[PDB]
């Protein structure tokens, strides 16, 4: 019992869906009724790798064996649905919570916050923020981080720096997040003076080491073979709190690097993240489908992934090269057509490879390119500013 739960929790934290699945089958093969905690662990393990259907199947099987859902199971469900931007599943689970009578803690509120942020619903995000402040409870660092990310995404510099100066007044040792999307938002409007004034304080960082390393390497001082090793050890050290934090860290870093003119550095960061285990759904290569998944990424992370995906396509044939802009219930609707992810990907492909990547006549959240259009096709110039 203890060994099964420990292994399953470790796999879920580390995003090892396959190992958790194998443990589940082995322990079910011995006529052992699974507990709620182990089922929650395997569900959250499946959600790390964006395997929503497997997590939903496990959640459905949870009630079959008599294991009732707990608060941790719901927290994992909201976090997994929020990472992918599936806000419809988010409000469905919220309705399930409201009809189950369980009180909503900060986890539900902030999971909804980033679920609407990744889905592009900025107005609903701020509405849910004001509702969170209306009722009760104190937002943690995660809530203000999510609102800073949503403000940076929706071209709001002024509220961004207001929240920045408000949050740093609490002596909280601001994390990699805040700096990363602050560089991103300042690079949105070519605020080179603000970027430099942030970097001047960022470079020293007498307190922590991670900030110093990343601030040195973003400027290009750590690009050498020996000078990238410090970045590699700091990345390895950071790969211990879990893939849930790793995906956010890589998203923020990629957005900052892409929006600061460091396209080659962003490409190399994405390349080193792929072998780590973060973004396991990023690339699929087979005779049938050559796909890139971006529904869990930010705008900056999408552009870096698309840039390196286009370059690999020109090197080489699959029956179809597709872009998974939106994944979830929104696919069978016109709502995903207007989504910021879909329109951003479409505009990027349109201005880079001309009118070759068309939409899908059956799916509302995919960008399509037949093999015939692949036949007629270094495409994206990756340079450091």
């Amino acid at each position: 019992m203890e060994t099964y739960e420990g292994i399953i929790f470790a796999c879920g934290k580390g995003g090892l869906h396959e190992d958790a699945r194998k443990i589940l089958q082995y322990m079910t093969a011995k006529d052992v009724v699974p507990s709620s905690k182990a089922y929650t662990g395997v569900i959250e393990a499946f959600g790390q790798a964006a395997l929503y259907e497997e997590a939903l199947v496990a959640f459905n099987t949870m009630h079959e064996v008599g294991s009732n859902p707990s608060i941790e199971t719901f927290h994992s469900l909201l976090y997994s649905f929020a990472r992918g931007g599936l806000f419809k599943e988010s409000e469905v689970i919220l309705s399930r919570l409201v009809n189950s009578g369980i009180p909503r803690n900060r986890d539900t509120f902030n999971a909804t916050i980033e679920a609407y942020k990744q889905g592009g619903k900025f107005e609903e995000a701020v509405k849910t923020y004001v509702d969170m402040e209306k009722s009760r409870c104190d937002p943690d660092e995660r809530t203000l981080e999510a609102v800073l990310s949503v403000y940076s995404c929706a071209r709001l510099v002024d509220e961004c720096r207001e929240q920045f100066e408000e949050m740093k007044a609490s002596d909280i040792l601001p994390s990699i997040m805040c700096y990363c999307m602050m560089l991103s938002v300042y690079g949105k409007t070519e605020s080179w003076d603000d970027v430099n004034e942030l970097l001047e304080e960022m470079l020293s960082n007498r307190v922590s080491n991670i900030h110093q390393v990343i601030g040195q390497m973003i400027k290009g001082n750590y690009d050498d073979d020996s000078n990238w090793q410090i970045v590699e050890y700091v990345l390895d050290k950071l790969n211990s709190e879990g893939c849930g934090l790793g995906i956010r860290f890589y998203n923020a870093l990629l957005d900052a690097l892409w929006w600061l003119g460091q396209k080659e550095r962003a490409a190399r960061v994405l390349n080193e993240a792929t072998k780590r285990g973060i973004f396991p759904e990023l690339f699929r290569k087979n005779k049938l489908v050559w796909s890139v998944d971006v529904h869990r990424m930010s705008e900056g992370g999408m552009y870096t992934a698309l840039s390196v995906w286009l370059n690999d396509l020109s090197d080489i044939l699959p029956q179809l090269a597709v872009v998974v802009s939106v994944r979830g219930q929104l696919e069978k609707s016109s709502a995903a057509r207007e989504s910021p992810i879909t329109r951003a990907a479409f505009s990027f492909l349109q201005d880079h490879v001309s009118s070759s990547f068309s939409f899908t006549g059956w799916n509302g959240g995919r960008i399509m390119c037949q093999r015939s259009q692949l036949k007629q096709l270094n495409i994206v110039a990756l340079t450091n500013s």
Binding site: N60, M62, E64, E89, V92
Partner: peptide, 17 residues
């Protein structure tokens, strides 16, 4: 006379939607 001849799948598995 009358005595002659001795006289659950598909549940908890619906579409999430």
């Amino acid at each position: 006379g009358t005595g002659f001849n001795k006289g659950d799948i598909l549940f908890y598995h619906r579409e999430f939607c």
